Amino acid sequence: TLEKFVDALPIPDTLKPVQQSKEKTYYEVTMEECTHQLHRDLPPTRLWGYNGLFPGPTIEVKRNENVYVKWMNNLPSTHFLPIDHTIHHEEPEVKTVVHLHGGVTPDDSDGYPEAWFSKDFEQTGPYFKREVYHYPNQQRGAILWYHDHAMALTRLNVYAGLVGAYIIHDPKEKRLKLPSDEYDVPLLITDRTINEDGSLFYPSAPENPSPSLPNPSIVPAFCGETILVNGKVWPYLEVEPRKYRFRVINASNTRTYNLSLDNGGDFIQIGSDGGLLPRSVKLNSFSLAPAERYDIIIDFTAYEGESIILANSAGCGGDVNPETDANIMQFRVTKPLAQKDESRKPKYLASYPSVQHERIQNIRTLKLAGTQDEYGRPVLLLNNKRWHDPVTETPKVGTTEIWSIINPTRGTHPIHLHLVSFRVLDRRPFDIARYQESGELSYTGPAVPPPPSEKGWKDTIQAHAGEVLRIAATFGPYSGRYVWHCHILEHEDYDMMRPMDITDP
Ligand SMILES: CCn1/c(=N/N=c2\sc3cc(S(=O)(=O)O)ccc3n2CC)sc2cc(S(=O)(=O)O)ccc21
Ligand SMILES: [Cu+2]
Ligand SMILES: [Cu+2]
């Protein structure tokens, strides 16, 4: 039973380039088995870490900076977490590939799940093309993050510790004078279950498993008993009584958070997955599903001396427990001011999306569903296709589509499209039983436009149960072979992921 708020929040160091010039910035990152202590009272934990760190180093780039990262695997040939060998398939047991989540990235640098590699690239997957990924960064400033994306192993490799932040700074943002430097802090939130000996627990099977069930077996969801921020269990952060910017990243496998401050204070949302909102939005609470990012300002100016808990009210396999998962971290407003707070919390942030969208080239209707496998396990599917089935989502480069995502299942799925960001058009409830019985879509209420939080640009979006969600994206500027998928990792791996081919005629 781990005492809350006894370790300081780590802030990952900013990765330094191996080589840098005005034309090119070159980085190296090596995946390593490592050990770090996750709580004051735990023995050190075995982990897989980018450059031996959990989370990985934070990478900072400018818009249009010509960046190269050689992601290397120096991992052991056997996993320390339970591999289910029935969900896919001579290949190595341990395979890896890094996806820069949110990256406007050429397809062979996107971290395709079948572009994996084993240690030193000894073996490579069928869609591997290159060692050194290229990130031209021709996109709006935003909070990105990087993490493993290997076929059939993503839930394990991420849970092992392969996550890191990547921030794109646009020099144009600077006139806004948003909190910066030490007043701009990433918060990577990961839930974990940890054994008494300090080792990570990840389930090798569902509860009360039939003896015919593979062993190990995948589970459809995982809720951790403990919450970590930047690699420490329920940490505290000393802050100055002034404005801070936080880059809030949900890097958890399944868990959705619903965040608040326990003094009833407000957040100011300045940004979503895809960058700055056109206007700042004052929020008392916000939902944050796997792979979503909220760029927020918290103004501690009026709370000097106070301890304020960043709290959580979203359940995960049950109601939050006030003593455990209802807590994320604690702010202590006890750091003396190092200088005048010259930062701002502006109302006006950026241009609205150009109202003159392109013409709608196509409208895809897509269903979230699940069948059962030969062992009785749920298999989560996009439009009843398996990963290996021939590609059906085939937008043309430079064209705009609307995707209507129909969710008749009992849960929310956070759906991520690679390469692009998109606008959220609306959500609308429908008759679930009728849809299940006849395949016919009968709305039970009007279309609800998104909340202000979702009026800018998104790349990972919650599709709630009993709703049709509509989004719009322009597919470009690159063509090639990408993916879209649920970002509950346990779903992603079996098998709620599909190829997405962006074509050039
Ligand atoms: C919310 C406005 N909206 C859409 N926006 N799409 C946009 S706005 C936009 C701005 C830029 S730019 O800012 O980057 O240049 C690039 C691409 C853009 N796209 C295409 C993704 S598409 C749509 C359809 C319906 S309808 O279906 O109900 O008629 C209703 C309302 C709609
Ligand atoms: Cu899902
Ligand atoms: Cu992905």
Numbering used by the authors: 2 to 90, 96 to 511
Which sentences did the original study use to describe this structure?
Spore coat protein A (CotA) is a protein isolated from the bacterium Bacillus subtilis. It is able to oxidize specific laccase substrates and is characterized as a typical laccase with one mononuclear copper centre (T1 copper) and one trinuclear centre (TNC) comprised of one T2 copper and two T3 coppers. Substrate oxidation occurs at the T1 binding pocket and the electrons are then shuttled to the TNC, where the reduction of dioxygen occurs. The overall structure of CotA comprises three cupredoxin-type domains, characterized by a Greek-key β-barrel topology, which is similar to other multi-copper oxidases.
Here, we report the crystal structure of CotA complexed with a nonphenolic substrate, 2,2-azinobis-(3-ethylbenzothiazoline-6-sulfonate) (ABTS). The ABTS molecule unexpectedly binds to the positively charged hole in the protein. In the structure of the CotA–ABTS complex, ABTS was observed sitting within the hole. The novel binding site was approximately 26 Å away from the T1 binding pocket and was near the exit of the water channel. The ABTS molecule passed through the hole in a linear shape and interacted with adjacent residues by hydrophobic contacts: Ile408, Leu431, Ile366, Ala478 and Trp463. The sulfonate moiety at one end of ABTS formed two hydrogen bonds to the guanidyl group of Arg476 (Arg476 NH1–O48 = 3.1 Å, Arg476 NH2–O49 = 3.1 Å), and the sulfonate moiety at the other end of ABTS formed a hydrogen bond to Ser360 (Ser360 N–O45 = 3.1 Å). The thiazoline ring of ABTS was almost buried in the hole, and the two sulfonate moieties of ABTS were exposed to the external environment. In the CotA–ABTS complex, conformational changes were observed upon substrate binding. A 310-helical fragment composed of residues 359–362 was dissolved and the side chains of Arg429 and Arg146 were rotated by about 40 and 120°, respectively, providing more space for ABTS binding. In our study, the ABTS passed through the hole in a linear shape; the B factor of ABTS was 35.6 Å2 and it had full occupancy.
